[PDB]
C-alpha cells in the first residue's frame, strides 16, 4: 500500500482543504540571520533596479548620490523589476483619483489628521514595535530609547517640558544643529550625531531611530485617513469588513458591464515591494496633496521623505577568517572588510568592491528604496491610484479593470468582450504600473474566471469563502500578569470567531490549550492534581478552608467557567459573587503590597 | 527568582513571614507571595465599589445573563448583539437565540409538519392496512400545541402550508388541496399543457430491463427549490427548454437534476450507471420503487453523480450575446461554453397561484392520485427516518414508540432494585440485617437485568460480585449504594479468569466499584439521591451509616487503611500474590489513589 | 509454586537437557505439598521479592 496524502482535492473543493497545506500559527524555527551577505545582495539589487548610471556628488558628505526618479534608462529587458519613477504621469493618477473621490478630498483628510496628531501626545511614540538606539547602538522597545534621548537631553542642553509631539519635533530638528551632545558618559559631534540619527539595523525587516519615528507616525495617519473612504483598500482591516468589500466589489461589476462582455479576475504578488518605493515620490506626491492647506503641514509631510533619501543602513556581523585546518578562526567587523579585499572570495569580492564609494566607516549611504514595513498605507494608496485610471483608448475598445489592492498582492478584475482584448488590457496595466515602479512576479501571479482567485489568504470562491488567518498568543515571550493574559487570549478568539477563521469546536480546543499554556506557564496546576510544585505546596494546605472551588481562580488552584457565550465576560467578573466572601475580599484588597484589577500583578 | 517587586510597609502591616513553609516570598518578592496574600491576609468589603467602577463589564455580564438561549441551525444566505455576533451567527450556521420577543408560530410548523412526517412513516410497516393504521395512529396522537392542548385531525386542515406528508396525511381526512406537487423535496406546478401516461423500458448492467413511464404530450411547468425558482417546458421524455431567476450554483444544480429527471432526459433512462448494477435493488424492504427516485438517490450519494448526470446532458460553446444568460457546470452564471437549452437571469420568477381546491384518493401504497394520474405526493419523496425528540405531544396507540433501550433498560433495572427495598419483610434490609445473602442471587429483578450483560465473560463478573456482597454482608460493614450497583452481576454461576476493575454490559457500556459514572453516581451529604444520566432517584428508606462503611467496596478481598506512602504502588493483577500485614497503595480512580490491606 | 517448581524439575531431569542455574533457584520451593492454584509467572518470598524461572532479575541473574 501507499498513503498518499493529497488524493482528497479530487472529489472535494480546496476552499475546505488548503488549510491543511501550511503548519500552524506560530514563532517560526528557521531563525535566518541577518549578516553581511543579504544586505550586501538587497544593496546591490536596489543599485541595479535603478536602470540609470547619473550621480550628483552632495555637500554634507562629500558622497555620490544614485539619482534614480525621471532619469530612466537601460529600457531593455523590461520585464524585470525596475525602480525609476516618473513624476508627470504619478500626479496625473493623483488628479484622476481626486476628481473621481473630489475636489476637497485630500483637504479634508489632511485637517483630519491634523487637528487628531495636535491634541497627541509625544509619548504615543512609545507604543513600537522596537526600534534601534541611537547612543548605545542597538535595537531595543520604543519606551527604553524614548528614556534615553530625553535623559541625553537633560544632560547636555536642558530638559524637554514640551510634553507634545509638535515640541519633540522641533527638538530634534534643533538637535540636528547642535555642535556637541552629551550622553551618559560621553559626548559626540554634529557629523556623527547626524549619521546614528540616519542609521538603520536589520532585525532584513528595517529597525529605525527614534528621530525619524513621529514623522513618519504622522504620514502614516494621514495615508489611514485616506485608505478608509477607498473602497479598494482592505490594509487598515481584514475579515467581515474585508468580505463585505469583496462583494461590494462584485456585485458592483455584475451589476455594471453588459450581456456582451465576459470577465476575468487575475491573483497578482508584487514582487520587491521594499526595493522599488522611492521616498522621492512620495515627497512629490505629500506635496501635490498638500498643496491646498496649511504651510505646516506641507513642511511637516515632508520630513520623513528626506530622512529616507538619506539612510544609513548599518552593516550587519563583520566576517570571519580561518586558517586551512580550521584550528585558528579570526574575527573582523564590517568597516575593515574593505582592508582585506584580497582575500574574500570572488562572489564576495564582486560585492563589495562596486559599492566602496558609497561606504563612510561601516554603513552605506542608501539615497532610496523603502526596507521597512512603513509607509504601506502610502504605497496601496499609489496601488489604488494604478487601478483607478481610465482613458478613451480603453472606452473605445469596450474595455477596463478594477480590483483591489494590498500592500504587496492585490486582485484585479479586467472586462471586455473578446479573448485577446483582455490580454491587451493586461498589458496596458502592467506598463502603467511598471511606469511608477510597481512591478510584478511571473511565478506568483496567476490568473482565472471571476470565480475562483485569493486575497490575503482569504480564498474566495462561487461560495465558502475561507480564512487562514488563525492568530493566537504567546505567553513565554510576553509575560505580564495572571490576570490579563488570559482575558487578552479569549478577546483573540472571539476576535478570530468573528473574521471566521475560527469555529466553535475549533474555538473550544484552542481555548482548553491556551488554558494549559498558561497554568504550565505560571507553573500552577488545579487542586485535584497530585503536583507537589512549590505554589502548589501552600495552596495543598489552604485549600480545604473554602468551599466555592467553582469560583477559585485559575491562578489558584481554580477551575474554568467560561465558554463561547461568555468570552467578553472575564473569570473574575464570572465568580465574583460565587466566591467564598473571605477568598474574595482577600483578592480585592486595594490595601495590598500590590483588563480587572487583582492583587495578582508582576510589577 | 523574586523578580516581582512590592513595597515595604505594605508587607510588615501585613505581617508576611518568610519561608512561611521553606517558601521565601521575598523591595522584591517572588509569585507565591501573592497566594499567601490571597489565602491568609487582610480583609476588606470594596465590593460595591469595583462594581460601580466596573459598571460597563458587569452590565455585559448581567445583559448575558439576561438570554432565553434557542436552537441553532445549519444554513446560508439565501449593538448590544455586536458584543455577542461572534457567538450568535456564524456563515454555515446560526442561534435564534432572543432577548424579549417571542411568538410561537413558526416552531409550532415545524413541530407539526416534523410529526406529520413521523406519522406517515409509521404507517408504512405493512401491505394492506396503510390507510387505517394511519388514521387511528392520527385519533391516537394529541398534542400541547403551542399553549393549547389539541389533536391532531384539525390541525392539519387547520393550518395552510403546502408540503407531502401535509398532503399525504390530508388526503386520507378528505381535505382541500391547492394543486401542488412534490417530486422529492422539490416543489413544482402546471402552468399549461397536458398528456397521458406512457410506458418505456430502461437496461440495467447492459443485459436486463425494466419498465417506467412518462408524459408524450408538451406541457410547462413551474419548479421551485431552495432559494432557485425556475420555468420549463417537457416533450416527449426530454427538455424542451428551461429558464431560471434564482442564483445559487449548489440550488441551481439539484433543481435542474430533479427537473431533468422529471422529464427523464438523458441516456441513463436508455441504459443505467454501473452503480445502479451494483444493486439493481429498485425495490424497498418487501416493496417495489421506480427508476427516478432510484436516480435520486444515487444523487444523493455524491456531487460527482451530479456532474454526471449534467454531463449526460450536452454541452455546447456559447455564443457571444449569451454570456449573461448562460451556464457553467459548476453553475456559473456566465461562461465561455455552457449547456444546451438553458437560460440563467436575475430576480425570482413570479410564482402562479391556484384557487382551485381538490381531493385526491389513497392507493395502497398511499400514493394520491387527483386526476389523470398526476401523482402529488407519496411516501417516496420523503427523507429518511429521523428520530427526533418530541414534546407537548401524546401517542397512545401502540407502535407510537418504541421506547425501548439499552440505557432505558439500566435504568428501569435499578428503580426496580431500589424499590425492592420497600421497608419491609422479604426484601434488601432484613436479609442484610439476617445474613442470608443466597437468596439475594435469586431475585427477579436480578433475573430481568441478566441479558443487558456482557455474555463472554459474565461468570467473573458475577464471582466478583458475589465476593463483593458476601464479605459486606458477613463482616456487616456494606454501603447499600455499591451493593445496588454490581447485585445484577450476581445471577449467573462464577468462574475463573482476569478481572480488570470495569464490569461491562452488552452496550459496550460498563460500571466499576468505589467510582461514580453518568450511568451510576452517588455522593455523600446526598446520599438519599442516585443519579442515573444526571436523572436523580429516591430511596425509598434513610440512612446516615449504612452507606459510611465502604471499607470493602473498593476490592474483593482487601480493606482500606491509613495512608502511607511508603507502600509500594500495585496493579489489580499481582493482587494474587500479597500477604497479610503487607499494605499496598493501588488507583482506584483519576489520580486517585488509596492504601489497602488484605483481609 | 512448589509444583510448577516440581513439574520443571522433572521435565529437566528425565530426559539431560537442563540448566543447572534453574534448579538450583527453584529447588527451594519444592519442600511443601503440591496444590491447586493459578501462577502468575512470579515466585515471591516473605519479603515482598521475587524471582522468575528463565528471565534474569536482581535477586537471580
Not at chain 1, 482543504?17 to 553581511?36: A, K, Q
Not at chain 1, 525619524?212 to 502614516?220: A, D, G, T, Y
Not at chain 1, 462561487?462 to 513565554?476: H, I, K, Q, R, Y
Not at chain 2, 387505517?132 to 385519533?139: C, D, G, M, N, Q
Amino acid at each position: 500500500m501507499e498513503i498518499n496524502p493529497y488524493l482528497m482535492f479530487l472529489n472535494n473543493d480546496v476552499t475546505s482543504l488548503i488549510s491543511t497545506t501550511y503548519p500552524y500559527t506560530g514563532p517560526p524555527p528557521m531563525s535566518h540571520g541577518s549578516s553581511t551577505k543579504y544586505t550586501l545582495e538587497t544593496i546591490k539589487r536596489t543599485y541595479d533596479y535603478s536602470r540609470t548610471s547619473v550621480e550628483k556628488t552632495s555637500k554634507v558628505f562629500n558622497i555620490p548620490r544614485r539619482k534614480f526618479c525621471n532619469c530612466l534608462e537601460d529600457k531593455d529587458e523590461l520585464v524585470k523589476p525596475t525602480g525609476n519613477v516618473d513624476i508627470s504621469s504619478l500626479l496625473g493618477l493623483a488628479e484622476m483619483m481626486e476628481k473621481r473621490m473630489g475636489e476637497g478630498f485630500f483637504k479634508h483628510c489632511v485637517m483630519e489628521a491634523e487637528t487628531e496628531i495636535l491634541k497627541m501626545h509625544f509619548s504615543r511614540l512609545t507604543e513600537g514595535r522596537q526600534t534601534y538606539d541611537w547612543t548605545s547602538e542597538r535595537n531595543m522597545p520604543a519606551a527604553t530609547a524614548l528614556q534615553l534621548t530625553v535623559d541625553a537631553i537633560k544632560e547636555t542642553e536642558g530638559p524637554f517640558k514640551g510634553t507634545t509631539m509638535l515640541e519633540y519635533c522641533n527638538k530634534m530638528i534643533e538637535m540636528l544643529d547642535w555642535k556637541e551632545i552629551k550622553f551618559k558618559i560621553d559626548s559626540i559631534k554634529h557629523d556623527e550625531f547626524l549619521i546614528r540619527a540616519l542609521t538603520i539595523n536589520t532585525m532584513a525587516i528595517a529597525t529605525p531611530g527614534m528621530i525619524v519615528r513621529p514623522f513618519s507616525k504622522i504620514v502614516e495617519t494621514v495615508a489611514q485617513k485616506i485608505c478608509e473612504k477607498l473602497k479598494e483598500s482592505g490594509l487598515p482591516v481584514g475579515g467581515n469588513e474585508k468580505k463585505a468589500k469583496l462583494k461590494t466589489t462584485v456585485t458592483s461589476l455584475n451589476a455594471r458591464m453588459n450581456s456582451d462582455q465576459f470577465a476575468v479576475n487575475i491573483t497578482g504578488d508584487n514582487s520587491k515591494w521594499n526595493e522599488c518605493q522611492q521616498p522621492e515620490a512620495y515627497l512629490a506626491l505629500l506635496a501635490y496633496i498638500t498643496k491646498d492647506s496649511s504651510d505646516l503641514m506641507k513642511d511637516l509631510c515632508s520630513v520623513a521623505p528626506v530622512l529616507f533619501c538619506n539612510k544609513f543602513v548599518k552593516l550587519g556581523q563583520g566576517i570571519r577568517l580561518s586558517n586551512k585546518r580550521k584550528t585558528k578562526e579570526v574575527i573582523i567587523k564590517a568597516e575593515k572588510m574593505g582592508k582585506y579585499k584580497n582575500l574574500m572570495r570572488e562572489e564576495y569580492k564582486n560585492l563589495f568592491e562596486p559599492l566602496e564609494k558609497y561606504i563612510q566607516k561601516d554603513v552605506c549611504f542608501l539615497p532610496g528604496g523603502m526596507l521597512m514595513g512603513m509607509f504601506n498605507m502610502l504605497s496601496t494608496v499609489l496601488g489604488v491610484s494604478t487601478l483607478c485610471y481610465m482613458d478613451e483608448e480603453l472606452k473605445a475598445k469596450g474595455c477596463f479593470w478594477t480590483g483591489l489592492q494590498s500592500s504587496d498582492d492585490f486582485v484585479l478584475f479586467a472586462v471586455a468582450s473578446n479573448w485577446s482584448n483582455i490580454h491587451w488590457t493586461i498589458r496596458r496595466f502592467n506598463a502603467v504600473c511598471k511606469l511608477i515602479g510597481i512591478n510584478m512576479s511571473l511565478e506568483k501571479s496567476y490568473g482565472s474566471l471571476p470565480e475562483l482567485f485569493e486575497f490575503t489568504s482569504m480564498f474566495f470562491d462561487g461560495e465558502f469563502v475561507s480564512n487562514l488567518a488563525m492568530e493566537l498568543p504567546a505567553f513565554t515571550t510576553a509575560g505580564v500578569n495572571e490576570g490579563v493574559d488570559f482575558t487578552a487570549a479569549m478577546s483573540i478568539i472571539k476576535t478570530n470567531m468573528i473574521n471566521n477563521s475560527l469555529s466553535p469546536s475549533t474555538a473550544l480546543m484552542a481555548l482548553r490549550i491556551c488554558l494549559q499554556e498558561f497554568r504550565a506557564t505560571y507553573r500552577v496546576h488545579p487542586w485535584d492534581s497530585r503536583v507537589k510544585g512549590g505554589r502548589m505546596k501552600i495552596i495543598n494546605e489552604f485549600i480545604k478552608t473554602i468551599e466555592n472551588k467553582d469560583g477559585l481562580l485559575i491562578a489558584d488552584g481554580g477551575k474554568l467557567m467560561n465558554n463561547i457565550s461568555t468570552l467578553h465576560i472575564p473569570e473574575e467578573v464570572l465568580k465574583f459573587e460565587k466566591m467564598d466572601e473571605q477568598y474574595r475580599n482577600r483578592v480585592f484588597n486595594p490595601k495590598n503590597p500590590f483588563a480587572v484589577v487583582s492583587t495578582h500583578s508582576f510589577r | 527568582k523574586f523578580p516581582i517587586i512590592a513595597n515595604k510597609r505594605m508587607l510588615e502591616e501585613a505581617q508576611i513571614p518568610k519561608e512561611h513553609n521553606n517558601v521565601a516570598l521575598w523591595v522584591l518578592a517572588s509569585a507565591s507571595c501573592i497566594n499567601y496574600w490571597n489565602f491568609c491576609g487582610p480583609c476588606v468589603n470594596n465590593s460595591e465599589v469595583i462594581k460601580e467602577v466596573y459598571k460597563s463589564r458587569f452590565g455585559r455580564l448581567e445583559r448575558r445573563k439576561e438570554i432565553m438561549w434557542k436552537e441553532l441551525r445549519f444554513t446560508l444566505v439565501d449593538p448590544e448583539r455586536m458584543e455577542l455576533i461572534h457567538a450568535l451567527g456564524g456563515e454555515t450556521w446560526i442561534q435564534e437565540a432572543n432577548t424579549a420577543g417571542i411568538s410561537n408560530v413558526d416552531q409550532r410548523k415545524n413541530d407539526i409538519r416534523a410529526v406529520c412526517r413521523k406519522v406517515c412513516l409509521a404507517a408504512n410497516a405493512s401491505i394492506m392496512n396503510a390507510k387505517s393504521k394511519l388514521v387511528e395512529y392520527i385519533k391516537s396522537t394529541s398534542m400541547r400545541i403551542g399553549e393549547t392542548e389539541r389533536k391532531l385531525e384539525e390541525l392539519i386542515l387547520e393550518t395552510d402550508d403546502v408540503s407531502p406528508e401535509v398532503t399525504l396525511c390530508k388526503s386520507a381526512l378528505g381535505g382541500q388541496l391547492g394543486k401542488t406537487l412534490s417530486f422529492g423535496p422539490m416543489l413544482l406546478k402546471k402552468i399549461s399543457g397536458s398528456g397521458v401516461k406512457v410506458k418505456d423500458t430502461v437496461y440495467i448492467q447492459g443485459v436486463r430491463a425494466v419498465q417506467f413511464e412518462y408524459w408524450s404530450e408538451q406541457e410547462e411547468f413551474y419548479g421551485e427549490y431552495k432559494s432557485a425558482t425556475a420555468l420549463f417546458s417537457r416533450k416527449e421524455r426530454s427538455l424542451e427548454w428551461i429558464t431560471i431567476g434564482g442564483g445559487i450554483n449548489e440550488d441551481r444544480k439539484r433543481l435542474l437534476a430533479m427537473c431533468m429527471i422529471f422529464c427523464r432526459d438523458g441516456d441513463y433512462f436508455k441504459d443505467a450507471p454501473a452503480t445502479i448494477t451494483m444493486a439493481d435493488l429498485s425495490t424497498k424492504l418487501g416493496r417495489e420503487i421506480p427508476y427516478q427516485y432510484v436516480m435520486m438517490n444515487w444523487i444523493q450519494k455524491s456531487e460527482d453523480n451530479l456532474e454526471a448526470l449534467l454531463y449526460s446532458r450536452g454541452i455546447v460553446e456559447t455564443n457571444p450575446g449569451k454570456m449573461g444568460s448562460s451556464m457553467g457546470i459548476d453553475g456559473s452564471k456566465r461562461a465561455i461554453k455552457s449547456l444546451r437549452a438553458v437560460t440563467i437571469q436575475s430576480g425570482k420568477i413570479d410564482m402562479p397561484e391556484s384557487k382551485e381546491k381538490i381531493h385526491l384518493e389513497l392507493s395502497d401504497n398511499l400514493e394520491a392520485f387527483d386526476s389523470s394520474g398526476r401523482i402529488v405526493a407519496t411516501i417516496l419523496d420523503l427523507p429518511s427516518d429521523k428520530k427526533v425528540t418530541f414534546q407537548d405531544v401524546s401517542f397512545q396507540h401502540p407502535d407510537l414508540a418504541v421506547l425501548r433501550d439499552e440505557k432505558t433498560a439500566i435504568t428501569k433495572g435499578y428503580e426496580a432494585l431500589i424499590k425492592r427495598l420497600g421497608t419491609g419483610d422479604n426484601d434488601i434490609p432484613s436479609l442484610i440485617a439476617k445474613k442470608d445473602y443466597l437468596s439475594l442471587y435469586n431475585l427477579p429483578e436480578v433475573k430481568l437485568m441478566a441479558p443487558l450483560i456482557r455474555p463472554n465473560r459474565k461468570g467473573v463478573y458475577s464471582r466478583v460480585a458475589r465476593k463483593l456482597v458476601s464479605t459486606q454482608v458477613t463482616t456487616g460493614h456494606y454501603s447499600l449504594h455499591e451493593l445496588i450497583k454490581v447485585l445484577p452481576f450476581t445471577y449467573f454461576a462464577p468462574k475463573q479468569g482476569m478481572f480488570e476493575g470495569r464490569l461491562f454490559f452488552s452496550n459496550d457500556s460498563f460500571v466499576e466499584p468505589g467510582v461514580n459514572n453518568n450511568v451510576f453516581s452517588w455522593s455523600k451529604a446526598d446520599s438519599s439521591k442516585i443519579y442515573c444520566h444526571g436523572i436523580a432517584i429516591r430511596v425509598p428508606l434513610v440512612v446516615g451509616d449504612e452507606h459510611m462503611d465502604t471499607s470493602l467496596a473498593l476490592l474483593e478481598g482487601f480493606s482500606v487503611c491509613e495512608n502511607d506512602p511508603r507502600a509500594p504502588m500495585v496493579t489489580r493483577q499481582d493482587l494474587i500474590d500479597v500477604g497479610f500485614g503487607q499494605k499496598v497503595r493501588l488507583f482506584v480512580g483519576q489520580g486517585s489513589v488509596r492504601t489497602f490491606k488484605r483481609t
